């Protein structure tokens, strides 16, 4: 009698827990057991579906992020290791898809609240199992050049990035060992996500991320936005649309004057019930 769903976007997979009134107690141990591929259900993170006001009432949220109303849908995102929504902006597509398909939300256009702020979404097509969702990821700020190892552009998409377009990089060359590097500390005093990518060839780009601390880890929403921004800017365009090939598949970034949008697939594989006894005995 504990409702859940299992979904994924490009790469990352999520367990969704509908909990409008935030009655569930998401201990670190419960999240970890639920994310364990053998002992639980297996996921990169848990997305508890609630509202910002309910989250703030139950202690999950202290004060509201700027732009997030007490009545907003709220994606209470937890990493497998109990920890809370690292900067990526991940989870929003699958979250939005869940809202639509489960009938919690009837409109194709609505706002997803999150720790990092409001994320307006557009649901282009929605079926039970598949959806095509656009996330308004926010203003992307180009902020000057920097070296890495590569020479790129500091792009601010809620958090610092350094996306590096390399004309002399191929898709095969991009199979380089960029797990666990060097960047200028004065330019990024509080660390930086480092993207490395091919030159825009026919509206498309191939990239890989190395997010701060977590190492080379899966797909990065905001980092994908940073990558496309830097690629457009290298072709002389402050705004445009690029397909971005990322580990797991492809997504489409749109940059406007005001903001940026990330558009990609979402899949919901399963829906059902966690056993109540199992939930209790998990820490």
Short summary of the structure?
This protein has helices at 28-35, 52-57, 92-101, 221-234, 276-280, and strands spanning 2-8, 13-18, 45-51, 73-79, 109-113, 119-126, 130-136, 141-147, 151-156, 160-166, 193-198, 204-210, 240-246, 249-255, 260-274. With 283 residues, the chain is of the alpha+beta class.
Can you lay out the helices and strands and say which pair or pack?
Layout (H helix, E strand, L loop, with lengths): L1 E7 L4 E6 L9 H8 L9 E7 H6 L15 E7 L12 H10 L7 E5 L5 E8 L3 E7 L4 E7 L3 E6 L3 E7 L26 E6 L5 E7 L10 H14 L5 E7 L2 E7 L4 E15 L1 H5 L3
Parallel strand pairs: 2-3, 4-5, 10-11, 12-13
Antiparallel strand pairs: 1-2, 1-15, 3-4, 5-6, 6-7, 7-15, 8-9, 9-10, 11-12, 13-14, 14-15
Describe the structure.
The protein folds into 2 domains: 1-134 and 264-283, Diaminopimelate Epimerase, Chain A, domain 1 (Roll); 135-263, Diaminopimelate Epimerase, Chain A, domain 1 (Roll). By secondary structure, it is an alpha+beta fold. Helices cover 15% and strands 39% of the residues. It has an 8-stranded mixed barrel with strand order 1-2-3-4-5-6-7-15. It is classed as isomerase. Keywords: alpha/beta, Amino-acid biosynthesis, Isomerase, Lysine biosynthesis. The assembly is monomeric. The entry is titled "Crystal structure of diaminopimelate epimerase Mycobacterium tuberculosis DapF".
């Amino acid at each position: 009698h504990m409702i859940f769903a299992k979904g994924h976007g490009t790469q990352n997979d999520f367990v969704l827990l509908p909990d409008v009134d935030a009655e569930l107690v998401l201990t670190a141990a419960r999240v970890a057991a639920l994310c364990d591929r053998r002992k639980g259900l297996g996921a990169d993170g848990v997305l508890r579906v609630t509202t910002a006001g309910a989250a703030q009432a139950v202690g999950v949220l202290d004060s509201l992020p700027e732009g997030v109303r007490v009545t907003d849908w709220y994606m209470d995102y937890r990493n497998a290791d109990g920890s809370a929504a690292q900067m990526c902006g991940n989870g929003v597509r699958v979250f939005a898809h869940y809202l639509r398909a489960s009938g919690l939300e009837v409109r194709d256009e609505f706002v997803v609240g999150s720790l990092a702020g409001p994320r307006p979404v557009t649901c282009h097509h929605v079926e039970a199992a598949y959806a095509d969702v656009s996330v308004d990821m926010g203003k992307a700020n180009r902020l000057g050049a920097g070296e890495a190892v590569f020479h790129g552009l500091a792009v601010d998409v809620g958090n610092p990035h350094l996306a590096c377009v390399d004309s002399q990089l191929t898709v095969d060359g991009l199979a380089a060992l960029d797990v666990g590097v060097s960047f200028d500390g004065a330019q990024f005093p509080d660390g930086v996500n480092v993207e490395v990518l091919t030159a825009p060839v026919d509206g498309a780009v191939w990239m890989r991320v190395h997010e701060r601390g977590v190492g080379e880890t899966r797909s990065c929403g905001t980092g994908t936005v940073a990558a496309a921004v830097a690629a457009l800017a290298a072709v002389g365009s402050p705004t445009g649309t690029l397909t971005v090939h990322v580990p797991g598949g492809e997504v489409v970034v749109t940059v406007t004057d005001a903001t940026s949008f990330l558009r990609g697939p979402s899949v919901l594989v399963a829906r059902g019930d966690l056993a109540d006894d199992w939930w209790n005995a998990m820490g």
